[PDB]
RNA sequence: GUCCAGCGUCGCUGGAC
């Protein structure tokens with residue numbers, strides 16, 4: 001779930017679960033070519049909380065930036 | 072590890088080996104030339120304008136000079152006689168070397184046989200030179216030719232110069248004992264009409280294996296030269312006859328194809344070499360760089376303490392524009408790194424040299440002067456003011472509006488972010504942001520003028536005028552005249568023009584509530600429930616009548632219309648802070664619009680003792696002005712800071728007018744619950760929004776503080792309650808106290824705008840307090856914190872209890888505005904309880 | 906669960922116990 005959870009801030013903080021996130025997780029992990037020590041680092045970096053801002057060509061770009069990305 | 076000294080002459084030819092930038096590229100191309108001759112052979116070093124296009128060529132020649140290749144002296148067609156052909160110049164330079172070699176040789180009698188052969192070939196070239204410079208054919212030369220000679224065994228008969236010149240080069244190579252001869256040209260940016268003769272003399276006379284040509288220029292300029300020579304081939308009578316759109320396309324492609332076959336044949340693609348800009352060499356943000364560049368900012372600096380080129384501009388932009396350490400400051404520097412090398416270094420050389428002598432200040436002034444002389448061409452096409460003496464307040468306000476007009480983006484235009492795709496708008500933006508930090512630095516009065524006039528003009532025009540490609544700018548010319556922006560006038564005068572423009576468009580149900588304004592009543596209403604009545608002006612007192620008087624505007628089109636614009640308060644405050652003395656402005660500002668200004672709708676419309684009480688109000692203002700003088704010297708506004716403040720302020724006002732619009736009720740007198748809205752409550756939140764927008768991002772974007780004290784959480788605006796405004800006030804309070812930093816030294820803008828006597832009555836009116844079991848907990852805590860920051864206790868014990876519960880003489884509180892009626896309400900329904 | 910508030914044109918979101 002943590003690997004497949006991503007949130008977007010447009011007018012109110014929206015939460016999403018996208019299959020494209022899973023492909024991003026596999027793509028990041030598979031390029032490790034490292035021992036056990038780096039796996040814990042890489043696996044911990046994959047699972048996190050990421051918030052991305054709305055593209056400029058939308059009608060809620062200014063409000064989203066104004067409201068700030070936080071909790 | 073390249074060290075650049077700004078105090079060197081910095082001429083194009085002044086660069087030595089240590090000063091040269093692209094040292095790796097120089098050796099790479101020298102190897103390419105050497106290899107090619109060992110095994111068309113025309114090299115083209117391509118570089119943008121003002122990027123080492125001449126110094127690099129000299130270094131390449133110097134490396135070759137010190138398999139043998141004799142380098143000809145570099146030539147440039149621009150600094151030559153107009154009508155002299157290239158072939159004559161090259162032949163002249165060949166003559167000098169071989170004659171110098173022959174005379175210096177002085178061994179045996181070789182220079183008696185070789186000299187005759189060399190002299191024979193020159194005479195042959197001199198005979199056939201008349202073909203180059205003939206405007207017509209001369210028939211008597213026909214018998215001059217056909218005097219065939221077996222000498223050199225020419226492949227083809229005739230008086231062709233190409234074959235004669237070829238044998239000329241072969242003899243010189245034998246004499247000089249060199250494998251090949253290198254001919255170096257130069258760019259034609261100054262006068263690119265002379266570049267055609269170079270191209271013709273390369274495609275005709277330089278095609279042997281003994282000659283290597285190194286040309287310099289810009290393909291974006293050479294293509295225009297060639298395409299011009301193509302359209303001169305079409306018969307004029309044809310160009311002016313078949314003017315169909317279908318035919319224009321047919322001839323358009325036949326030329327855009329003909330030039331490419333010319334270039335791809337004359338300068339082969341595998342031989343072109345592109346120069347490197349600063350961004351490529353240095354790197355993006357934290358990315359590793361291909362090379363290392365460092366600069367020196369002082370003659371006394373040590374070579375072991377030279378800072379990086381990125382950091383040198385980084386400080387010149389941070390304090391130059393008065394910007395903090397953040398991404399937005401890193402966006403300006405990144406744009407500068409993509410500038411031409413000459414322009415990038417000149418603005419740095421001017422800035423650091425002038426700054427050093429000044430110390431032996433006004434740092435932004437040096438940056439503005441450097442930028443003005445640098446991108447002075449882009450200003451002219453933008454059309455901004457170019458007169459140094461007219462640099463002022465309104466002239467700057469004109470510049471902002473025109474730049475937004477050219478950019479065609481009224482939402483984020485005033486941010487002055489260099490994000491426009493066009494190069495002129497990007498260049499003009501950085502200069503403009505410097506001027507904002509110039510005028511508005513150190514004075515509160517000018518800051519409020521930029522906020523209200525510089526950015527207010529753009530936003531209002533967006534929503535009330537632009538809601539046909541010739542009507543659009545017809546309004547722009549009409550709009551710029553009506554607001555009278557450009558003329559030297561006070562901000563208070565601008566407020567009335569702002570009031571007239573907005574009020575023309577009637578909203579749904581024609582309620583008298585607009586963006587930051589309320590339309591009060593002039594005539595008498597019939598059968599009004601409760602104590603609702605007309606707004607009687609002469610019932611206020613000292614420090615309250617003046618607050619109202621400076622907040623009243625009138626427009627005299629059709630019937631007389633009154634208003635209570637909050638924009639007037641901002642303008643009135645600016646005027647007081649301007650003069651700061653003489654006790655006359657504070658006498659005159661309070662009475663400037665009440666009975667003198669007769670505003671008319673825009674043409675696009677389609678319709679106690681007085682003496683003993685006023686001086687007490689006057690004296691408090693003079694006390695406020697005394698404090699401003701000693702603290703406002705530390706104001707360092709930036710174009711980002713002012714632009715962002717208007718954004719939050721504008722959005723906040725639009726919501727308040729749209730949420731209190733339908734909340735008027737027949738029993739909304741002295742409104743105690745948040746679901747009831749009176750006239751005084753609307754004006755309370757209008758002045759509260761302005762006091763809130765400053766607080767939120769005074770911490771975020773100001774330059775005096777290196778961090779923010781807001782904390783973590785969503786940024787929200789007060790529209791119905793003061794829960795959000797109080798919440799931020801508290802949180803900063805402990806953060807500013809746990810770490811010992813006074814409010815004056817971190818939020819100078821908010822400290823001054825919160826202690827102004829004009830806004831004090833508006834903060835706590837009679838009918839604008841939320842009286843509830845839970846609400847009064849916040850309001851009281853709001854009152855305690857405001858008084859603690861100001862120091863003075865605004866409200867005494869008796870009046871505070873009088874307001875909260877449900878006539879005591881009041882001087883620091885509005886008392887009659889809530890009872891005043893509002894046009895279009897009619898107060899039929901009643902408040903609902905649940 | 907309940908109460909307050911904020912964004913969009915009822916839905917969404919923050920915060921408190």
Ligand SMILES: Nc1ncnc2c1ncn2[C@@H]1O[C@H](COP(=O)(O)OP(=O)(O)OP(=O)(O)O)[C@@H](O)[C@H]1O
Nearest residue numbers: 081082083090091092120121122123124125126413
């Ligand atoms: N290697 C270098 N190191 C430092 N500065 C350089 C270097 N090469 C060029 N410059 C800068 O470029 C400026 C002028 O460059 P250059 O004359 O080659 O360009 P140009 O004016 O476009 O070309 P041209 O003079 O042939 O018309 C110099 O004054 C100098 O500031």
